[model samples]
Target: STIFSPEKALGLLLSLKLSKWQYITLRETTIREGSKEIYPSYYKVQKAKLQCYPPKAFVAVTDSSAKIALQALLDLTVNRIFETIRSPDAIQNKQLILISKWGFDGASNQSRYKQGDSSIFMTSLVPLKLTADGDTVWVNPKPCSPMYCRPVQFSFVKETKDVVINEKTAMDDEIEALVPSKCQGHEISHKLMMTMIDGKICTYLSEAKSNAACYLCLYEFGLSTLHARINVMECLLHIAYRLDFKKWSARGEGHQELLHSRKKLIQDRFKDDLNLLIDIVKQGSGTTNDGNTARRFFEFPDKTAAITGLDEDLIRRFSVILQAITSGEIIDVPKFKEYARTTAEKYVELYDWYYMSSTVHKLLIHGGDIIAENAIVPIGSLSEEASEARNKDFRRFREHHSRKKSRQASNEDILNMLIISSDPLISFTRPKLDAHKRQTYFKETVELLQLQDQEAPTEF
Candidate 1:
């Protein structure tokens, strides 16, 4: 069996001490009580297990591998605890307050009107010492010893108080008032008690022996027994690592080298596992162009105006249908028809507004202007005397200029004249092949569909 160096041994002890209590509590709560009192317990167990166990545990668990695995497991547990405690959110939220009392006069009490706001106070508790025979070493409290506990009070003052409603107030009205009410009271005290219990357990396991016990428990049972087994493994791994076997030295430079190599391997593997988890979460949650396309489409001005003009219920129904279609979920055609009808009714209402808008009015007025401007033309350029002498020529010139301006076609006509004079191909192609053929083709196809179908298809 491989023997652990003093450094490796101490590290193993640290892991056991810090995590043992947490593992035990977790297992007890999970197995015996069948309750999930602690949130994120799986994460907590994984963090502790990875730290306390060694690379040797990953190595074959043979007679030769046992001590090495145990050592590696211990070191892993210790390191993981350090990293977890250092996390900003973890550390800040993990503080637990122990409550000595819960009533208004108690140190932990927060309520004044049978319901008041108060702060919680707590103190760290030390670990239970063990004797040579594996029994807990306990010391009786001395009467003169000052109590290490601190008072934590939460308050419920003017901010929380409201005059109690009389019998005339309905239950709904009372509930409405209470919905936003804030009070610091016994509930806060109970929460603090639970937090303190969790914190105490976590804090105790941070020590070396506790972590070792946790590792041994995981090996014998499963990772679920970590908290209870942490302390046990703490003592067991240490003894196992110190015991001399036939091939391996109980203590020496060779032992130190082996332990160091094993530690490095465990650290590297843990780092790799952590990196993999980070990449998985990042890929899963990160936004992509495909996800944002619909959001961007709705933000366009025309689309937003169209959506906003629809009835709210119809818009919501359309959203559900679109979501199902995009997600490739099965659609109910009859339900879809119902939704479509509601949406179409909303669009019809909006169309009336569109027809009455100033933009539509301008389009109609401009169409009349185009018809009037096209009614006149100039035959030729005239001399000032001829133009002045003939009212018909002046009127024709004025009408021609008005038509040019209204059609915005003077530049095009000039360019066309130049092209026709320079290139024979332009003149032939312009008349023989209509540039608006694509528009004509589209119009004809739509007309055909309308004629055959009896009802026109809806436009987007």
Candidate 2:
């Protein structure tokens, strides 16, 4: 049986007394809930990212309204969950105070979202601050008792593509350039340092100094910059694209499909295993009655000028940076900057300091903000995939309830389910392992624990 320590007792008291619920509950929210009598539950559709969470009872959805979304979570108490903490544990608190991340698969959930002009989404995260210091944009959140609310363009620059018999010919050249360079020996790619930028510059260039490097860069023992598992097979689509096979047609990868397909198909589909989500090339957005759908250079509401080589390989690199910003697997980012700068040169767009140094900034510096705050807590950096999964889980759970009878579903019931799940039964049952095994398990656990040495190591 495990025994309690004075250290734990003291730490727990301090945590509760300060109303600082440090445990981070991964969050997934939806605005889709039927209206209710207490008020329309526009805010009630939030969910935690877990199945059978605090073990089993967690329905994984918040039952709040649009206004409640902006409320500062002071204390949560269910059974003193202490008016939900930072006190005598008035309300059993977890869902409200500990809900720290917001993630969604659609760009509309984030980038493109705002009410009128100020981002409503931003306003929803009270006490959060946005700080930008040259080549770096950081979102700092000071957890409060509760409360409150709250770029760019690259044109006038390079005149389209550098060289081409014509514009379409230039497009053709840029596309062809995505192919690995032929070894003229002298045709080798040259490395450029990834520049740093802040705020709006993350999507585009900010200054005269060299800008950022490609997001695909990372230090690894792999054959290239982006790490690839040894068993991962080469994506055949990239191979066909590389060999210049016009009749070639292919697209298959996991996460989008079943078992084996997920395992293969993404190993450096571009030059250096840039095949992260290679099939996204087929993705389309916005439609026009006219066949011209790729849209004009400035037509993009993103304000980012339509970058030239928007091909499968180049697109793959874009996903690379995004995933980098969201992945917890990474620790040292500057190392990634080196890897990106060196590796991206082997691909297209970033082949030279011109557009690269002039366009997107390095992911390491500005991307820091996405992760810095969480390093102080246990919640992993925000992940769209996690949030997406949480939403899906909530969908299934709601489906279990009768749609017409959902009006009968109570927010208080949802609240209890969350509280129950968040602190479900901890098995008093047990394994009193041999000292050696216990030591081994303890050491392994310590490896993952970034926290230690509380106010009292032996107070209990």
Candidate 3:
């Protein structure tokens, strides 16, 4: 087996960075076979240090042909060690003692483990032993230190047996001692009979009683994944719209002309994932058949299946909302509230038929699923539209003001126009009307009458 140390942490990080899956598997296994404190601390330090250095070299030593079987066994055992580490609850009660300087320094000397670092360090001092007829492995947790004293030096004490060996044994050999030979067959026969007779009846009754609550619970759980997918799609759509508008605005040739700027950020950030998500949406809508080959592609099985079950209207409404949002229609808060309420009511109606045997609590919970799905598209689209609208409005206002001087006939007219435009219509009109009424409307009428003859009528 390969050994680990604090000095090798940087190398491990490099290996992990090069191939994430392989690294994670190996790291998890070492932690499982060793100690939890050592695993995460080793991981953290190596990861932080790797940023400054090149990765460690990977050795590819071949086993001898005569010991090929032994090599295979060793590899299998090592792999199992890591697998147990990945399973968080598997090693809960199992003892892992620190036997090396690296493990001791990382766990005892450093504050990393107590502070909850995700990376760890460790070293395997004792190698696994494979006997001719059995397998044996030693895990040494205690080691005498030349420097430190007492609690610090003795911290490496082995909490359990250091060696474990398993011989080649049949399944019967393990359990036969529990029951007599005559009773063994009888007990097995009785177990099968009981499972077939009583087990099935119990399972059926339990499922029937909790079916409604199960639907609700399943739906809420599924919604988390669905919500994430929707957010990702909405973000992409917003970016696409912004890019389209930017290209559209960049169409002129003046010294001070607005330069249309495209956002390079989205392409830099999520080019591949965004494309994949779009394809997913298209597949969900049945615009293409490629995604149908994947068994679970976008469609929920349990709660989503039942909620979307035979209800064509719910599906139709959902499709409408998606299309409307994709086409740039802004769905505001009030509109979304209405949609949510309508969806809840429709779910209630459907529940009356499909869920006739369901309790009131089950109906209410299932109804929440309907509202959740209904709300997703509108909420996503509205957020995108609001940002795009703000940008477009600002651009248009700037363009209009830039040509203000050229559009005016005279300086006086420009000044009057600016004043009139700047004032709010309601504020300007009401006050101006009140002032005019008090200041003699008849005077302006007389002045207009005096100039009426001076104005010549030319057209018939």
Candidate 4:
């Protein structure tokens, strides 16, 4: 444990942006005159990349053209996983399962290039436990926490058609050839699964020829929970805008004019009444109607229904369903199926002239089956929200923590900082302060949960 003091100090300095001169001044002031052993200078620290992480933290690149170090990440995380499991205080008799979600996305506004999207393809692993009753439990309860989501690589190319093809081939080859490491009295290997992708990438990978049918299959590969909420909220907003005409599409100019008027009235009412912004454009990216906005809208069902003139019962039903799916508890499948079936029927009964949105339709029709098949894992644990939120970390790290002298050095520093911050050993010893108490589940939502007699704990 004492061996970690210097490393931890270095990490703290790096994280808090301490300059070499200032660091040295402090060190000199505190140390005895005869001491030869001292803190490394800023220059020495910059050159000490290999010493900053665990052994085999990085490896040489096979293809000189590709700058990302994929093998190194594998070796580093695999070693960490073994060590964590065999630690003295680890749970006994629980079978360990290594799981990870691999994905790629493009980040625009990251660099100054005219053609400027830096597409990053990466994977992060978490250990899961197979309970006696076939439930999957995270070794770390907070599996989706950013500190536990270790990144595998950073590539600076767009996730274009050709790039996706080549990346898949290269990634497949590497994982196939990777030799299992023997550490902490255990040996382990990995088998890749095609999981954790967004609706857009699903379209590209499946080559479905259309966006409609492919999204239906998104249920199989760990449903994109965030997108589901966004789509449902958008569907509700659309229905409200067309409530006066009671049509999916406007029949003519008169109907469209009425919809336009109603939409404006509702948008303004939401802002004035609930202080919620809806259907507004965001800076440099998508609109403001995100997952949180959707949750807030449903939280106040009565106000939302009054403002939008939508059915209050339907809004409340939707709120319950959304809360149930994302509740992070194992669901009672048969009861949930019945509830969703009824909800879907009610929507059709009330708004027979209006067509249902694909996402909402998917939820009401096939949501139960999707939940049933992934019985070993909670549906909420399989979300892409953690990875999606990491985009903000990428931008913030790039701007604040990296050296901007050159692109190569800058990327190198950024990668190093990310690894240091997310390193499991370091994360384990750090203080955790972001423990905001979770609100209790609504009694209606609890009716659909699969809970033990004493299992209704506070939410996280």
In terms of TM-score, which candidate is strongest? Answer: 4
TM-score of predicted model 4? 0.71
List per-prediction Cα lDDT, in the order shown.
0.26, 0.24, 0.27, 0.56
The best-first sequence of candidates by lDDT reads: 4, 3, 1, 2
Tens digit of per-residue lDDT, candidate 3, span 295-330: 122233232224223354553444343333322223
Q: Candidate 4 vs. truth: CA RMSD?
A: 6.1
Badly placed stretches (over 4 Å) of model 1 are 1-226, 229-249, 275-460
Better of 1 and 3 by TM-score: 3
CA-RMSD of model 2: 21.7
RMSD to true structure for each model, in Å: 44.5, 21.7, 33.4, 6.1
Tell me the deviation in Å of residue 404 in model 4.
2.7
Query: What digit string (tens of lDDT, one per residue) describes model 2 on residues 1-460?
Result: 2132222322232223211122111111212243223212212222221211222232222222111211112111111121122243222222121222211111111224442111111111211221122311222222211111110001111211221123224323332243222221211121111111111111121222222344443221111111121111122222222332222333444123422242233223322432133333322421111101111111231221122222434434433443233222333445545545544555433333122221233332333332333332222212223233333323333343223343323333333332322321211111233432212112212332233333111100
**Model 3 lowest lDDT segment of ten:** 189-198
Clashes of each: 55, 52, 12, 0
Writing each residue's lDDT as its tens digit, candidate 4 over 121-220 gives 5444333322222333335556445556555555666546577667667666766676654444544444444443433444455444322643554534
